[PDB]
């Protein structure tokens, strides 16, 4: 846990708590997509959380090997529970960037929104959000454009930022 | 919204988003305990969230007048969504201090835990937590003792801190 402590916002005792919990509740030593889906389907039982769970699982699976090891699980938790707003937004951008190419296109945003609406149990609004986010009008939202609009003081962007914070 | 902006972590445009949302979804201009219970019963449908909702409502109702005005709603949200860990812990202490006397006794902690377990759908563990938290052994947990143990590096306290963060 020494290296993990040095790489995350957790002390060794916090990592021992997470580790013990991880070894008990998840014996294979990794979190598979099936587990993510179960965790979210339990919590959002009155909707279909499978797609969102899928994107979320891919967000945790940084190596894209289909297996979230303890190290990956803690790294994500470190950011989500204790990272700066800057780190949290970057983690979120990477969640929306489905195919992990470093860009978010309108379809991808559309898929993310539908996955969220499916979880909570549309198009028009997204075309409005995407247009405001794609600053240079070239059909792709880069990390820099994402950071800017998701921290800018514009009523529409503020609305979206609030939803994302609660999300 | 000028004074509110000066008193919270929200800019005027963020407050306009919250205000518009508040005027639509909650026409009386205040949030009554019945609304809090409905909001939480919806989100945690497979359990009884009424008691927790009750303590939470009392936490928002700082004036203890039985009515959460927009100002009170935003003040709480400011802390929960953007306050420092110090401010968030103080807000939380006040949530657990059911009778608002500035002290948390074992019964109160017991009630809070049961309300949470009821929401998620016991005694022994709480007697262990309370004992570790009441530093001077006088049967009451003050804000200072709460802050200390809920920021200290002890495996049991770390376990509890994690649960509270996720809670």
């Amino acid at each position: 846990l020494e290296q993990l402590e040095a790489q995350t916002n957790f002390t060794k005792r916090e990592l021992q708590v997470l580790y013990r919990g991880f070894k008990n509740e998840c014996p294979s030593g990794v979190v598979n997509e099936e587990t993510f889906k179960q965790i979210y389907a339990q919590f959002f039982p009155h909707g279909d959380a499978s797609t969102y769970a899928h994107y979320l699982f891919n967000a945790f699976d940084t190596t894209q090997t289909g297996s979230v090891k303890f190290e990956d699980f803690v790294t994500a938790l470190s950011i989500l529970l204790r990272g700066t707003v800057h780190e949290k937004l970057r983690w979120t951008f990477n969640l929306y960037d489905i195919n992990k190419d470093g860009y978010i296109n309108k379809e991808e945003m559309m898929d993310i929104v539908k996955a969220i609406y499916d979880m909570m149990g549309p198009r028009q609004h997204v075309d409005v959000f995407f247009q405001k986010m794609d600053k240079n009008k070239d059909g792709i939202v880069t990390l820099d454009e994402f950071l800017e609009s998701c921290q800018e003081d514009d009523n529409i962007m503020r609305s979206l930022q609030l939803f994302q914070n609660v999300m | 919204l000028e004074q509110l902006e000066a008193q919270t972590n929200f800019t005027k445009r963020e407050l306009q988003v919250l205000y518009r949302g508040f005027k639509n979804e909650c026409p009386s201009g205040v949030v009554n305990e019945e609304t809090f219970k409905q909001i939480y019963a919806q989100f945690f449908p497979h359990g009884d969230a009424s008691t927790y909702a009750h303590y939470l409502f009392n936490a928002f109702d700082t004036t203890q007048t039985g009515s959460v005005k927009f100002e009170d709603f935003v003040t709480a949200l400011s802390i929960l969504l953007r306050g420092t860990v110090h401010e968030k812990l103080r807000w939380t202490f006040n949530l657990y201090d059911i009778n608002k006397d500035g002290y948390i006794n074992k019964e109160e902690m017991m009630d809070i835990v049961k309300a949470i377990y009821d929401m998620m759908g016991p005694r022994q563990h709480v007697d262990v937590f309370f004992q570790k938290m009441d530093k001077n052994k006088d049967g009451i947990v003050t804000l200072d003792e709460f802050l200390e143990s809920c920021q200290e590096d002890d495996n049991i306290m770390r376990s509890l801190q994690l649960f509270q963060n996720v809670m």
């Binding site: 708590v17 008990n24 949290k88 | 649960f163």
Partner: peptide, 21 residues
């Protein structure tokens, strides 16, 4: 983001109960 985190409440509760002898 809070909703995504909140889903891990069962795990959190289990992790805490795992240290209470």
């Amino acid at each position: 983001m809070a909703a995504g985190v909140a889903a891990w409440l069962p795990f959190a509760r289990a992790a805490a109960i795992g240290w209470m002898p």
